[PDB]
Design a binder for this molecule. Structure first.
Ligand code: MOO
Ligand code: MOO
Ligand code: MOO
Ligand code: MOO
Ligand code: MOO
Ligand code: MOO
Ligand code: MOO
Ligand code: MOO
Ligand SMILES: [Ca+2]
Ligand SMILES: [Ca+2]
Lengths: 67, 67, 67, 67, 67, 67
């Protein structure tokens, strides 16, 4: 129940932990892949691990269109 | 060939024009819907129309993770 | 349970509805005020109205520091 | 005098330096905590340190609403 | 003294007002042009108009690279 | 042909690699400089290095105005 209109369910297929940030790669419907860069603290708090089923969220104003 | 690593192909299923901004809704693999808000100038220049085959692009640092 | 680390509870003190976007102003702790621009559809779906108690959410990478 | 309408004064209560990025945590009115991830270069240039009195700035189009 | 590392001085050559947002177009050094979409209220508050000399500011995390 | 209206051609004058992110600094027309923080993987994938000619891309909704 958040304003961000793009909510994409997926499964974790990759995780890389940096000093401040962390990279999460999710496989969503149709084989598409979504890549997320978040704080390292969050990775630790949401129990992010390979195989976990999670949801990618994006604000509409952050989505560009390519023709 | 742009750094934004998230590229999701889709078809236009919704279009609403504002004074400065415009809203484009794309249907992607699995019926998921991606909503984008961009400049009105761009819709016009990219010739966005119902049925067009376009692509949604998102920077990794804009993707959040939900548990 | 989302990665975005900034979650600020507040009360709606202002709402302006545009064609594509909408502006929401919330009063949070200490009298601070937060201003949000979201899609008009969201305003309609989350039942946004003056007096409503809601939460402002922000990704860490979108926060700048001013000295 | 910048368009970002959200300006929240606070004191530094956390600082973690990465190779490229850095994390700053500010305590604002009510003990709320704001977390910011910026360039390592900037922390150094703005002389960010525990106890400093700084200000968090956020563009309105980056603030989401949660119900 | 804001952490955002991109500060581009320029002159207003275009200004379009919408209901909630506004579009500002600046001509910057060297023949380049920058386009910004911000809140209508900020435009009104900073007294933006054709001919004004202002600065465009962008967070490093929001700049993409294209090859 | 991406909707992002800001496309600034430039040359790489600085490149710093971190664990998850990377910092690219470009010199653009007219003596201006642009700094970008993107994923380390994209840098590696687009083969970014000192001297390369590339383009910085920014969404209009991410450009702030300072008076
Ligand atoms: O209504 Mo949003 O937060 O622009 O997706
Ligand atoms: O070590 Mo970083 O600056 O979190 O990629
Ligand atoms: O390499 Mo990006 O531009 O953070 O997706
Ligand atoms: O960068 Mo975060 O961990 O989505 O607030
Ligand atoms: O009428 Mo708007 O301000 O382009 O949604
Ligand atoms: O007027 Mo803003 O820069 O969308 O907060
Ligand atoms: O990521 Mo910055 O240091 O706000 O440009
Ligand atoms: O808001 Mo835009 O049309 O992606 O620059
Ligand atoms: Ca943004
Ligand atoms: Ca952003």
């Amino acid at each position: 129940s958040i304003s961000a209109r793009n909510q994409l369910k997926g499964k974790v297929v990759g995780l890389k932990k940096g000093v401040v940030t962390a990279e999460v790669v999710l496989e969503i419907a149709g084989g598409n892949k979504i890549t997320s860069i978040i704080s390292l603290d969050s990775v630790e708090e949401l129990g992010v691990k390979e195989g976990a089923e999670l949801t990618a969220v994006v604000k509409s104003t952050d989505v560009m269109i390519l023709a």
